[PDB]
Amino acid sequence: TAEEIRDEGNAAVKDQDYIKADELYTEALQLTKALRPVLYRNRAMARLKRDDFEGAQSDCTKALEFDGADVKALFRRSLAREQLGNVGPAFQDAKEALRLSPNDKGIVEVLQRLVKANNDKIKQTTSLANKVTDMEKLAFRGEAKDTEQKMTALNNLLVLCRESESGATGVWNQGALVPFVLNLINDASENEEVTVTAIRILDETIKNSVRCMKFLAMHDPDGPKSVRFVCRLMCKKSTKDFVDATGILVQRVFNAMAKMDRQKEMKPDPEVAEANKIWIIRVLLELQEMLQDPKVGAVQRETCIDLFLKNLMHMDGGIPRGWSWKFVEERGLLALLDVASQIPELCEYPVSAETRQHVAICLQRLEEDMVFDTKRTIFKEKVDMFFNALISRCTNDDEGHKYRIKLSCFLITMLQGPVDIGINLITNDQLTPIMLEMAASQDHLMQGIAAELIVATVSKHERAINMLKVGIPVLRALYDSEDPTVKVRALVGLCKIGAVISLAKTCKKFLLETEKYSVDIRRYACEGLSYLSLDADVKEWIVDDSLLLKALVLLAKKAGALCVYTLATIYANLSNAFEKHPKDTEEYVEKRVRALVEEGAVPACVAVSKTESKNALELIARSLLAFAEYEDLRGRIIAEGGTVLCLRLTKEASGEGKIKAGHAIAKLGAKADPMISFPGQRAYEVVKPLCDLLHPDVEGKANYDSLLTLTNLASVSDSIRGRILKEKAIPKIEEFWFMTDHEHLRAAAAELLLNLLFFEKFYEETVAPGTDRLKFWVLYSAEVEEERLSRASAAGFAILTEDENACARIMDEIKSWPEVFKDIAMHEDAETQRRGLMGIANIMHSSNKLCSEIVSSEVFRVLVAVTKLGSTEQAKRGLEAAEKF
């Protein structure tokens, strides 16, 4: 339609929903030759309110190729270059915007900032250069006789580049940071955390898109080999943290290519995606070459699969539409299916036991990303080609045994990820004789793989029973094995369709033996016990043994993110965290939760949580929500990494698990110290979910905890207050603040709006003559049965009456002010009396007419009664105003 979309974007700006407006103007630019500058200007304003300053600068630079006399592009680019640290060109843009519109007050405020910033710019740059020179000679250029002081220099550079955009500019040092890091990575005799902290510094530095594309194209004048070096940096070392940090570097490369960020909820710009499309296809080709390269190790391959998972799918904030289609139609899907056919016992390229779930989540996300029925059909055609290619080589020879193994691995990875495609492949009647052949074999690995295939088949739907009718007794045969690798895989399935007491004892027997039984055994034991744990008797049975909980925690810390679904299902059922029997009672729920938290459930949760499964992270979020119910435990939950984990869960879980993670954060920070519980930049990113908890219409218990946590967060710094105002929270808080039969919600809303008055924009909106906010600030000071509302509103009345226009509006707009004032002057609570007399006193110091109105009123007798006996000094100050006038 190409024309109503900017109208919808303008309506989204007027609704103050700026990410929707950014997406709409990005959509409207895609349907275009003189309507483009309006789109770039309004999209620059939308990105500027979005804290996207690079994109605002880009859209203003593109909007000036049409008319260089454009005051909007100049002003918005001055703001964007201000927030990026380039104050000189910001000054020049704002100077040209001032000489083309000399009466705009916003440009005057911008010039008032930028002249003071340009007078001190050179000293700030040379001081920052001296700081990074000190820390960078002590970190990279070899002035250190100890490892931990080089570590301290690296942590200082990391905090400095995370503090400001100018800090990242100074640490970048026009591109000397990446030789200083690469000639440290290639030193194999250097410490792990040194290298990982250096790469964390580099990842923060590349968050800029221009520096990151510069970083991509600089290692070799041949483009694809520079791309290959950047993508193969993870193969330089075998440590997990190194591979994770290098994967974050490649994530930065993707985020600079498409101009996307899933952490910032930033859908990509297709103009800058098509602009450097060649770099995107080069990185995708190099990573899918890394999927099947046997010189690439296991965790590097898992990281590449996670990069495809996060980045390629356009339905999950990734690389836009047409790229995953190309990935399926070409040889990338077949590479994922070939990695799906792998086990550590039989692999062609290195594959760990965790690789299967990474492939399964990536394949499920890709099957979801094929949105139309034809592309889903092409997906099914390629998996049928791979299925038929495997099953045509399943001969009865020794060679065909490994193809039977590959076929079974393929189908298990199907049934753990894209479940319905797997169920469609199970209903082949050529498939179940292969299972009956490998189950009746002498090879124990084939017996185990048949057992885990037929437990992968057990779901709710009944058309899989076509195999399960022969699968369940065969499984009951395999439980009679004297091999534990077959016995636990047959114990799953027995636990999954259901005797139960006998099973639970068998799962406990496998799980308690920690040294002699490996994590491969205890994983399937934990999976079977997760299947059993829906019954509350076995819940109380698990909780009543402490050493079983210790064994589950040891399995979590040693197996890592391999037992996420199982342990998270255990923790969710034991905590009764699923929303809705004599033993699912809140005393018993509290007993189970306290026992879990007492023996390390939260470090187990943070140990298993390094996956991209939205469902398993939803389970972890529900577990942490049920953990954070109890007020004496939540400090230990904060101390055991719970706040950072829930801040990850509110970004990367399922859509209904984000809500549970946010309610968990609200519980954790309701009655806690926000400097300890949310230290530093964390207190920024906690503002985003908690405002989304504010539902005055739904009216749950999450609203009070969210108001208390935002009240605590609004007391630490002004940036928190501005971001609370930025997230459209003020009407949501005012809806609680207007409630009549809800005392404590109104009190918490008054406390939060009291702490938000120290932010000057909300202070100026409260004084402003549009609203009746001052009326409620005055009348809630005299609404006297609730001490806390009166204290908060009297404090706000004391603060808001050091503006004389607010004093005049309180006088002429609020009728029955003398009753309110004589009540808060005689007031029973000391804090309310003190702040109310402070407000009355600076009303009288504000004007002579208003002081003459007060002295000739009902308020004067109680003022002179207070002065003739802390709050007496404020009434004395008001009588000093009366003596002055």
Author numbering: 7 to 38, 43 to 508, 524 to 605, 627 to 915, 923 to 938
What text appears in the publication on this structure?
Subsequent studies in C. elegans, Xenopus, Zebrafish, and Drosophila confirmed the role of UNC-45 as a myosin-specific chaperone, promoting the folding of the myosin ATPase domain as well as coordinating the assembly of thick filaments during muscle development. Structural data of various functional mutants clarify the role of the distinct UNC-45 domains in this process providing important mechanistic insight into its myosin folding activity.
In contrast, none of the ts-proteins shifted into the HMW fraction further confirming that the ts-mutants, present in a folded state, cannot interact with damaged myosin. The two UNC-45 ts-mutants L822F and G427E crystallized in the form of a linear filament, having the same periodicity (85 Å), hydrophobic interface and overall domain organization as the previously characterized wt oligomer. First, the ts UCS domains adopt different conformations, as most clearly seen for the C-terminal portion of the UCS domain that moves about 10–15 Å. Moreover, as revealed by the L822F structure, the entire UCS domain is able to move en-bloc towards the TPR/central domain backbone of the UNC-45 molecule. A second difference of wt UNC-45 and ts mutants comprises the dynamics of the UCS domain. In contrast, the two ts mutants crystallized exclusively in one state, even when testing a large number of crystals for an alternate crystal form. As for the G427E mutant, the established inter-domain contacts reduce the conformational flexibility of the UCS domain, which seems to be a common property of the analyzed ts mutants.
